[PDB]
Amino acid sequence: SLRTKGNAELILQIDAYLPDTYISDQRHKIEIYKKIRQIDNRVNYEELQEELIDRFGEYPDVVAYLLEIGLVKSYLDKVFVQRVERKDNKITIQFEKVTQRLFLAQDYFKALSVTNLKAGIAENKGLMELVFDVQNKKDYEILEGLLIFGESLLEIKESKE
């Protein structure tokens, strides 16, 4: 309580940023970068796209990803993910000890069960970790899985009051 959301650490090795080719002016970048770290939910995100196209035209994939990751993150944050780290075709999510209040094993399984990534749950130091095999997987597919997984899990959370 008093804490609305967590703050997940994302090590995804997707290349995402604002290229000089899209935004030249320094203070813009800065602003938009902050703006991006400001994404709390979908509508933000959506408006942020509306904004960028609005005043910078179509954006390249690295920008798309910067955005996606932002959105994605907002979710992993609300379900109190502590770290997502991709390491040798193995993305492995770990949560805060608090999640043990919010979630049960099948809560996670449900959420994975519904993404296209193939996953498993493992016990590391008494806690639960999700590990996705991400071989052959394009960034957008990983973003999609994470995305879906996250929003999938938020609904469970909301689902208790």
Side-chain angles (χ1 to χ4, degrees), residues 5-26:
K5 81 222 292 296
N7 180 6
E9 183 186 22
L10 264 44
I11 300 142
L12 278 46
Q13 311 161 333
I14 314 295
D15 282 326
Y17 72 112
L18 280 21
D20 290 2
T21 350
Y22 188 56
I23 297 167
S24 48
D25 198 317
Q26 230 160 21

Side-chain angles (χ1 to χ4, degrees), residues 26-49 51-121:
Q26 230 160 21
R27 16 177 215 67
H28 295 253
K29 292 166 150 300
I30 299 168
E31 154 191 326
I32 289 78
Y33 266 133
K34 160 161 285 197
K35 260 284 227 307
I36 278 191
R37 295 183 155 186
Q38 309 304 13
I39 304 184
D40 188 35
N41 63 78
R42 180 160 272 270
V43 328
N44 304 201
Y45 172 83
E46 298 196 327
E47 292 169 318
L48 203 35
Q49 301 179 316
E51 177 156 19
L52 291 179
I53 289 112
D54 182 32
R55 54 166 175 153
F56 301 101
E58 275 294 43
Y59 50 82
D61 294 339
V62 304
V63 167
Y65 298 145
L66 221 207
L67 295 171
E68 206 63 12
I69 302 185
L71 171 58
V72 164
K73 189 176 189 302
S74 73
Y75 290 101
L76 304 307
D77 288 346
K78 299 182 179 175
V79 286
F80 299 95
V81 164
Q82 160 172 308
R83 183 169 83 196
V84 188
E85 162 171 12
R86 153 158 208 199
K87 158 82 180 159
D88 290 305
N89 294 181
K90 213 57 86 174
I91 290 180
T92 142
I93 292 174
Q94 40 192 186
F95 303 98
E96 312 186 30
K97 279 174 64 207
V98 148
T99 59
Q100 299 176 219
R101 283 281 295 180
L102 318 175
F103 305 134
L104 300 179
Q106 60 272 177
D107 284 336
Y108 298 135
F109 187 84
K110 226 313 182 220
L112 309 161
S113 278
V114 87
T115 86
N116 274 11
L117 276 29
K118 92 161 163 59
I121 300 171

